[PDB]
Amino acid sequence: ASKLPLVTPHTQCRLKLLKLERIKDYLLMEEEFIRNQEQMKPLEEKQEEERSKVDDLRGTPMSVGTLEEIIDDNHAIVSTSVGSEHYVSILSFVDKDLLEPGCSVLLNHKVHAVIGVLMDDTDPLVTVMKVEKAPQETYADIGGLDNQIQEIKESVELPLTHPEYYEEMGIKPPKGVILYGPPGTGKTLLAKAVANQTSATFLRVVGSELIQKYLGDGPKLVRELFRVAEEHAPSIVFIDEIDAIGTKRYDSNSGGEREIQRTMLELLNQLDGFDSRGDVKVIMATNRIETLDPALIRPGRIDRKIEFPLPDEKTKKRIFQIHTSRMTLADDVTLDDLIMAKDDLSGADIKAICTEAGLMALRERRMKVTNEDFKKSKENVLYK
Amino acid sequence: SRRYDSRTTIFSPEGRLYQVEYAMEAIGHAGTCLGILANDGVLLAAERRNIHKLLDEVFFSEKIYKLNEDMACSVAGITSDANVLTNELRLIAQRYLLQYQEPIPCEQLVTALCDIKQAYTQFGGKRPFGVSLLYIGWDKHYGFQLYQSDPSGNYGGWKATCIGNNSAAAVSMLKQDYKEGEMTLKSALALAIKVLNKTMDVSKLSAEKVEIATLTRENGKTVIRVLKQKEVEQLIKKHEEEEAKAEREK
Numbered sequence: 111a112s113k114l115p116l117v118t119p120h121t122q123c124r125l126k127l128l129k130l131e132r133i134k135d136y137l138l139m140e141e142e143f144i145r146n147q148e149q150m151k152p153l154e155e156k157q158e159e160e161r162s163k164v165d166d167l168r169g170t171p172m173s174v175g176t177l178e179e180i181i182d183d184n185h186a187i188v189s190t191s192v193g194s195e196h197y198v199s200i201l202s203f204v205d206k207d208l209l210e211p212g213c214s215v216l217l218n219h220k221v222h223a224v225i226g227v228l229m230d231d232t233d234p235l236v237t238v239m240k241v242e243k244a245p246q247e248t249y250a251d252i253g254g255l256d257n258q259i260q261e262i263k264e265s266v267e268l269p270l271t272h273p274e275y276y277e278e279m280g281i282k283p284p285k286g287v288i289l290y291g292p293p294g295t296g297k298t299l300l301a302k303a304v305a306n307q308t309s310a311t312f313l314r315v316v317g318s319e320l321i322q323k324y325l326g327d328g329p330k331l332v333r334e335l336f337r338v339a340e341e342h343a344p345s346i347v348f349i350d351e352i353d354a355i356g357t358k359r360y361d362s363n364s365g366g367e368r369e370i371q372r373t374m375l376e377l378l379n380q381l382d383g384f385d386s387r388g389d390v391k392v393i394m395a396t397n398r399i400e401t402l403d404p405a406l407i408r409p410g411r412i413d414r415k416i417e418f419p420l421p422d423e424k425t426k427k428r429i430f431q432i433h434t435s436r437m438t439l440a441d442d443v444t445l446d447d448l449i450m451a452k453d454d455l456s457g458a459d460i461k462a463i464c465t466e467a468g469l470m471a472l473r474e475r476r477m478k479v480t481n482e483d484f485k486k487s488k489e490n491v492l493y494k
Numbered sequence: 495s496r497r498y499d500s501r502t503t504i505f506s507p508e509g510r511l512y513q514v515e516y517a518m519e520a521i522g523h524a525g526t527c528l529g530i531l532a533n534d535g536v537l538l539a540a541e542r543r544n545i546h547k548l549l550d551e552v553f554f555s556e557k558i559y560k561l562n563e564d565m566a567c568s569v570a571g572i573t574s575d576a577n578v579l580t581n582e583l584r585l586i587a588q589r590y591l592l593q594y595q596e597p598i599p600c601e602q603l604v605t606a607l608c609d610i611k612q613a614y615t616q617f618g619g620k621r622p623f624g625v626s627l628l629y630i631g632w633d634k635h636y637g638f639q640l641y642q643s644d645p646s647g648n649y650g651g652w653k654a655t656c657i658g659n660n661s662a663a664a665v666s667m668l669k670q671d672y673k674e675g676e677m678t679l680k681s682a683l684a685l686a687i688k689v690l691n692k693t694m695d696v697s698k699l700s701a702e703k704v705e706i707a708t709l710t711r712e713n714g715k716t717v718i719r720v721l722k723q724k725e726v727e728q729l730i731k732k733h734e735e736e737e738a739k740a741e742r743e744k
C-alpha cells in the first residue's frame with residue numbers, strides 16, 4: 111500500500127531491476143524482522159489475541175453516539191441519543207483522527223466511554239442529485255452547432271484531459287459557463303453529451319427546485335449542495351432553468367421575493383467566495399437571459415456566455431437526417447418540403463414530428479413511414 | 495409624476511419593443527378574416543363573432559367598410575379602435591378626390607394610413623392600435639388589388655390572406671390550393687368555403703355566422719356586392735356535395 115511511487119525508467123533496465131531488488135531486501139527484512147517476535151515472544155497469537163482483548167474490552171451493546179466537542183486528553187462531552195449528554199473518556203483503539211463535531215461514535219453500554227467511531231451511511235440526497243451513468247450518445251448526436259461545442263470542450267473538457275496546455279501558457283481555465291437562447295434549442299441536449307463525455311463526478315439541478323417553504327432552507331440547501339460538490343472530486347455542477355427562481359412566485363414559499371433574494375445571495379457567495387474553491391465546474395442554462403441578476407453574471411463568476419441560435423435550413427436537413435437515421439423511411443417523403451414548413455422550427459420540433467409519425471405508422475401496424483404521415487403529422491405537431 | 499410614466503415607446507435591451515408585440519399578440523385572437531382573388535373580382539370572407547340570438551343584424555356589414563366607391567376594407571381587432579380609422583382614412587380618400595378630382599391608388603392610400611398608425615408606435619407616449627386589416631380595390635393602373643395592414647405600421651401586397659385565429663393553418667392550405675390568375679370568382683369561392691370550413695372550429699357552416707363581400711369591375715361601377723344569406727347556403731351545401739363524393743370515391 112503506497113510502497114514506492116517511482117516508475118520513471120519504463121524500460122528493461124537494471125534501474126527498474128535494482129529498485130525491486132533493494133525493496134526485495136527491505137521486504138524480506140520486514141518478514142524476518144517480524145518473524146523473530148513470535149519465535150521468541152509467542153506469548154499470544156497477536157492475530158486475534160490482542161484483537162479479542164480489544165473485543166473483550168468493548169461490550170456487545172454498542173450504543174451509537176454523536177460528538178459535540180473535543181478535549182485532547184482522551185475525554186470529551188458526547189451527546190446521547192436521548193440527549194442527556196455525558197463526559198466520558200476515549201480509548202486508545204479509537205485512532206484519534208477521524209473525530210469531528212457531530213460524528214457518530216461507538217460508546218460503552220455501561221460507562222458510555224468512546225469505544226470507536228462510526229462510518230456514516232452516506233446521504234439520500236447525494237445519490238438523488240448525483241447522476242450515475244452517461245445519459246445518451248456523444249456529441250455526434252447533435253449536429254449543426256460545431257462552434258460552441260469547441261467552446262464547451264475548451265472550458266470544460268480540455269482542462270480535464272490536457273493540463274499541460276495551461277501550464278505552458280501560465281494560465282488557469284475559465285470558471286463559469288452559461289447557456290442561453292430560445293427554448294428547445296438543445297441546451298440540455300448538449301449537457302447530455304457532456305455527461306456522456308466526462309469522467310468527473312456530475313451533478314445536475316433544475317433552477318426551479320431551489321425554492322423552499324422553510325425559511326433559509328433554500329440557502330441551507332445551497333450550502334450543503336456546494337459542500338457535496340466540493341467534497342467529492344473534479345465535479346461538474348449543472349443548473350438548468352435558473353430564471354424560474356425569478357419568474358414564478360409560489361405560495362408554498364412563506365417568504366416572498368425577499369427570500370428568493372437571500373437564496374440568490376447565498377448562491378452568489380458560493381460562486382465567488384473567499385474560501386478556497388477547488389475543482390468544481392459550473393454550467394448554467396436557461397432561456398430568459400435578460401431577467402436575472404447581472405451580478406451573478408460578472409466575470410469572476412461567469413466567464414463564458416454562450417447563445418444558441420435558431421437552426422438554419424441546411425442544418426435543419428442534418429437534424430432531420432439525425433432524427434431519421436435508423437428509421438425505415440419509405441421513399442415517398444421529401445425532407446426539403448419538411449424543412450420550409452415552419453420557418454423557425456426547433457430541433458425538438460423535428461424529433462416530435464418524426465416520433466409522432468412513427469406513432470401514426472404504428473396505428474396502422476406498418477413498418478415504413480410514408481408522406482401523408484408527415485402531412486397529417488405536422489398538422490398534429492405545429493397547428494393547434 | 496414620471497413614476498407614473500410607462501414608457502410605451504422605448505426599445506427592449508434585445509433591440510425590439512414589447513408593446514406592439516402585445517398588440518399583434520392580441521390580433522391573433524378575436525376575429526377571422528380572409529381575402530382571395532385571381533381574376534375579375536375579389537372576395538372577402540369574414541366570420542362573425544357575436545352570434546347571440548337577439549341581434550337586429552343591420553348596418554349592411556360587420557367588418558366590411560366601403561371606403562371609396564371602388565374600394566373597401568375588412569377590419570380585424572378592436573372595433574371601437576377601428577371605427578376612427580375607417581372614417582379617418584375615408585376623408586383622406588375624399589381629400590384626394592378633392593385635391594385631384596380623381597379616385598385614389600389603393601396602395602398609396604394604404605401607405606398614407608400606415609404612416610399615421612406608424613406614428614403612435616414611434617413617439618407620443620401613446621397606446622397604439624391593435625388593429626390590422628385587409629384591402630380590396632380596383633384602379634386603372636393595376637386593376638384589382640389586395641393588401642394587408644399590420645398594427646406595426648408596415649403593410650403587404652398579397653392576393654389571398656387569412657388573419658384568423660388559425661391563420662397560418664389556413665395559409666398552409668392556401669399555398670396548397672390556388673392558381674395564379676385562373677382561380678375565377680367561383681372557384682375561389684368554393685375554395686374559400688373550404689378554407690373557412692377548415693379554420694371554422696364550429697362545423698356545419700352557419701351562413702349567418704359568416705360574411706362575404708365581392709368587388710367586381712362593372713364598366714363604370716366596380717360593383718361591390720355583399721351577397722345575401724339566400725345564396726350562402728347553396729354554396730355551403732354545394733361544398734357538402736362534392737366533399738361526400740370526394741371522400742367516398744377514395
Ligand SMILES: Nc1ncnc2c1ncn2[C@@H]1O[C@H](COP(=O)(O)OP(=O)(O)OP(=O)(O)O)[C@@H](O)[C@H]1O
Pocket residue numbers: 251252253254292293294295296297298299300397429432456457458459461
Ligand atoms: N440541434 C439539434 N439536433 C438534434 N436534436 C435536437 C437539436 N436541438 C434540439 N433537439 C432535440 O430537442 C430536444 C430538446 O433538447 P433540449 O431540452 O436540450 O433543448 P433545450 O433548449 O434545453 O430545451 P428547454 O429550452 O426546454 O430546456 C432534445 O432531446 C433534442 O433531441
Ligand SMILES: [Mg+2]
Pocket residue numbers: 294295296297298299
Ligand atoms: Mg431543454
